[PDB]
Amino acid sequence: QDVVLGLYYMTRDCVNAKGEGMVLTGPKEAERLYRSGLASLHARVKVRIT
Amino acid sequence: SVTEFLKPRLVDIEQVSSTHAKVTLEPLERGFGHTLGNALRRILLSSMPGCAVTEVEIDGVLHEYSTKEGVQEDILEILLNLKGLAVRVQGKDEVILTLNKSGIGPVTAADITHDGDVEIVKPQHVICHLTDENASISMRIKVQRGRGYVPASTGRLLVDACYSPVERIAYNVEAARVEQRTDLDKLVIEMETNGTIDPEEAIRRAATILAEQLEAFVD
Amino acid sequence: TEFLKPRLVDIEQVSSTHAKVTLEPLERGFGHTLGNALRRILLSSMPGCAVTEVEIDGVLHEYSTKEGVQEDILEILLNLKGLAVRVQGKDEVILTLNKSGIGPVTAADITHDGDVEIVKPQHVICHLTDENASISMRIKVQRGRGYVPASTRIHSEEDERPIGRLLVDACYSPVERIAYNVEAARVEQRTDLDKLVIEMETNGTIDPEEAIRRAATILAEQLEAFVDL
Amino acid sequence: REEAVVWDILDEVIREHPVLLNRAPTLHRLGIQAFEPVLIEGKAIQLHPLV
Amino acid sequence: RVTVQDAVEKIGNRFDLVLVAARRARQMQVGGKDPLVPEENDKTTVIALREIEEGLINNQI
Amino acid sequence: EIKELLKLGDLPTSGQIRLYDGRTGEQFERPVTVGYMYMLKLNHLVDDKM
Amino acid sequence: KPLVGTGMERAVAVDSGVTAVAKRGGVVQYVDASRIVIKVNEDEMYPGEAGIDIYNLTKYTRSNQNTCINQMPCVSLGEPVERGDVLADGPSTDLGELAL
Numbered sequence: 150q151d152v153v154l155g156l157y158y159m160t161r162d163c164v165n166a167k168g169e170g171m172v173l174t175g176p177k178e179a180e181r182l183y184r185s186g187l188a189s190l191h192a193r194v195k196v197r198i199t
Numbered sequence: 200s201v202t203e204f205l206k207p208r209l210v211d212i213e214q215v216s217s218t219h220a221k222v223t224l225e226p227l228e229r230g231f232g233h234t235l236g237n238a239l240r241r242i243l244l245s246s247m248p249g250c251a252v253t254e255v256e257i258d259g260v261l262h263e264y265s266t267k268e269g270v271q272e273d274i275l276e277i278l279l280n281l282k283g284l285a286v287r288v289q290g291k292d293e294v295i296l297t298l299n300k301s302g303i304g305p306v307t308a309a310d311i312t313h314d315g316d317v318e319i320v321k322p323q324h325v326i327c328h329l330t331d332e333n334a335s336i337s338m339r340i341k342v343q344r345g346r347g348y349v350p351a352s353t354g355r356l357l358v359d360a361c362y363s364p365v366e367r368i369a370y371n372v373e374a375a376r377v378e379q380r381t382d383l384d385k386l387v388i389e390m391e392t393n394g395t396i397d398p399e400e401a402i403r404r405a406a407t408i409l410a411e412q413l414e415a416f417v418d
Numbered sequence: 419t420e421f422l423k424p425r426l427v428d429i430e431q432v433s434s435t436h437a438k439v440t441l442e443p444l445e446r447g448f449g450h451t452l453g454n455a456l457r458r459i460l461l462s463s464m465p466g467c468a469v470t471e472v473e474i475d476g477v478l479h480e481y482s483t484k485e486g487v488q489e490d491i492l493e494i495l496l497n498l499k500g501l502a503v504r505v506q507g508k509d510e511v512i513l514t515l516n517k518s519g520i521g522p523v524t525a526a527d528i529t530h531d532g533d534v535e536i537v538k539p540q541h542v543i544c545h546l547t548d549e550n551a552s553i554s555m556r557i558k559v560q561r562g563r564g565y566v567p568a569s570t571r572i573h574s575e576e577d578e579r580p581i582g583r584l585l586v587d588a589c590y591s592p593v594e595r596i597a598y599n600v601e602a603a604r605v606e607q608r609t610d611l612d613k614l615v616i617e618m619e620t621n622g623t624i625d626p627e628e629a630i631r632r633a634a635t636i637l638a639e640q641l642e643a644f645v646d647l
Numbered sequence: 648r649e650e651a652v653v654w655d656i657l658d659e660v661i662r663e664h665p666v667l668l669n670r671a672p673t674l675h676r677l678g679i680q681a682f683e684p685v686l687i688e689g690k691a692i693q694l695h696p697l698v
Numbered sequence: 699r700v701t702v703q704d705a706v707e708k709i710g711n712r713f714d715l716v717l718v719a720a721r722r723a724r725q726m727q728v729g730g731k732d733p734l735v736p737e738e739n740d741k742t743t744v745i746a747l748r749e750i751e752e753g754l755i756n757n758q759i
Numbered sequence: 760e761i762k763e764l765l766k767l768g769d770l771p772t773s774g775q776i777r778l779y780d781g782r783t784g785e786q787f788e789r790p791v792t793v794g795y796m797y798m799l800k801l802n803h804l805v806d807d808k809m
Numbered sequence: 810k811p812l813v814g815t816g817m818e819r820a821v822a823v824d825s826g827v828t829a830v831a832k833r834g835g836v837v838q839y840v841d842a843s844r845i846v847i848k849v850n851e852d853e854m855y856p857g858e859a860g861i862d863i864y865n866l867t868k869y870t871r872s873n874q875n876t877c878i879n880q881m882p883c884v885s886l887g888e889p890v891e892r893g894d895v896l897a898d899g900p901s902t903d904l905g906e907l908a909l
Contacts, residue, residue, distance in 0.1 A: 152696075152697075168350065171350065171351060171359075172275065172279055173279075174279050174280075174282060174283055177366045177367040177391070178348075178361070178366070180367055181244055181348055181363075181365075181366075181367065182348070182350075184240075184244060185244060185245045185347075185348065187348070187350060197276075197279070200562070200563075201465050201509070201561055201562065201563060202465065204463065204636060204639075204640070206639070206640065206642070206643055207643045208643065209643070209647055222647070224643060224644075227640070228462070228463070228640075229462070230458065230462055231462075231640060233458070233782045233783070234455050234458045234459060234637075235640065235641065235644070237782065237783050238451050238454075238455050239644065241447055241450065241451045241783075242447075242451065245446070245447055246445070246446060246447050246448070248419055346419075347446070376686075378651045378654065378655070379651070380688070381686070381687075381688045382688065399647060402644060402647070403644065403645050403647055406641055406644035406645040407645060408421070409451075409641060410638060410641055410645065411421065411423065412423060412424060412444075412448060412452065413634045413635075413637060413638040413641075414423070414638075415423055415424055415425055415426075416424075416426065416630065416631045416634035416635070416638075417631070417634055417635050417638040418631055418635055450784055453784060454781075454783060454784030457781075457784070458781065481868075481869045481879075483841070483842050483843050483868060484841075485841055485843070486841050487841060487842065488840065488841070488842060488882065489842060490842055490868075490879065490881065493881075520886070547839065547840050547841055547886050548839065548841070598784070662741075663740065663741050663743070663744060664741070683700070690805050690806055690809045691805060691809075795812055795813075797811045797812065797813065797909075799909045802874065802876070
């Protein structure tokens, strides 16, 4: 149950957020963006993916 | 005992790539695996100095909104892909470089006008692909010295700056033991970095940044 | 490269036990990075000074009782565990205590020394409650760091202690809570210079002007392994 | 005597000897399972959360 | 390493993998032979499973 | 009436407080409940069963 | 003490008989965590008696389940007490409230 709670919380979208709407080159700088507190985790974004 | 706390040695450089390594320390006193792992994390990911691409001027554009033809991927992607280029600037605050290429095929950072004063530390970085018998593109790329990661908050095209060379850093603490107790911490630091600097030395730079703060308190 | 380095500009010993200290200026993030590192170090690793054994004249084990005293011997040990003292250049010392006649017994009754200094004379050990009543006891203090429970300690001593000693659990670490806070301040006509405030509650044996430097020292030497790699 | 060597021996004995944990009742085959042990200071059996 | 499925790809009956891993581990522990895989001071339990990974064991041997 | 008592203390009447994680000093997202439950040690303590 | 209770603790701890309860009113004459002794007042004394109620408290002893049961004083020397006041806490009580 707690694992799924965490994954639900991690993957929601909140229509207002810090750092919302920018475009990123990958998960790693997604993480740098999260961890430094520059973007909120459920903020909307576009990323390059593979 | 009273002021001779246990000190680690590196148990390994544990190296798996030139881009990424898993530098592990043992033993650390209980709880110090965070107190250093995260402290060096917060240094490494946000306050390491370095040089990065900062602004772009492709030939004749006001906004990457304009999807100029002759290129396969549109200017929004060229703009981020040029953020992907790792660069070294020697002794200067900001430096502009010029790039051009012609003929049907890819474009690479190797095609930049390499000043030698500046090193493009990964030339084989593809920039775009060209799509007509007449396809050629020419642009100015600004590179700048700065610190950390700075978002797009502040014909020029602005872009976020990746001044810190750390692509990712992560750390764990885990059980370690000696002959009579197991409440001590191991620390694993894992990091991956853009090739400007080797990681087992980037951390030695960062440990210095942190050490320099303490220099005014240490007796 | 533009890093401003800190100095520990100011201190406020708001009480005989509580104090504030401030480190100023700091760059981006370093207010947080030191702010938490020093809190976590100050809680784990400041050395201090604890009672460690007690011998009371006529008692035999922790669970007994003494005629004419208001506490079971056990609650005397729970009281002395909280007693805190400085010691000057010593790894340990023995304190004698004597009292007779009705009324409280308090740390002020310990046979004082120049080389021991007690933070709070009024910390109370028991009551005496009969006209002829007495207690005499030899409290042994040791320096140390962290916490060491007596069960592991006697398992670490490996000789057999005599009948009629009592053992207490050791709680050396002298800081009871630490808080940190970060804010901008007037320097060089510029913004984002953090005045770190660290403010602290203690058992009273130490002063921040040592404590923050000692914590910074511990950090500075633990960190050597990461530059010596 | 629990001498200082014995743990470094133990951490060689056990180093990959599966031990079988089962609750009771044990309704179905998944109710006995084997795990590689790792040593602990306390007295509880530390089980994996998902299991 | 622990999951034996890649050894079961080679001994397509899973019961025969226990009979073969035991037989081979006995040739090591009891019969006095030594492994064709590089050992890492693993138990014979693991060495014999690591001998299926080299693809050089079946119950002919 | 609980709110009224919490207001008489100088306490936050939401009952919740923002907390930080002592592993990093990061703030938790959204406040969390904090307060004085009563807890009993039960007579099933472990060394009596190991 | 539990900080939140129901006010039934003031009854369970007394009626369960394990706190030592003042049989007659008076003043505390002596206390030492083994004895408590009460100079009962003459308004509740019986005429030929010395007029002094000792309470020898039970100290560390096994419960039937091996938990200890040491009673401890709650009074002070010279303090007045009234019939039915708690003189000494039981196990799991303080000031006569239940306190598990």
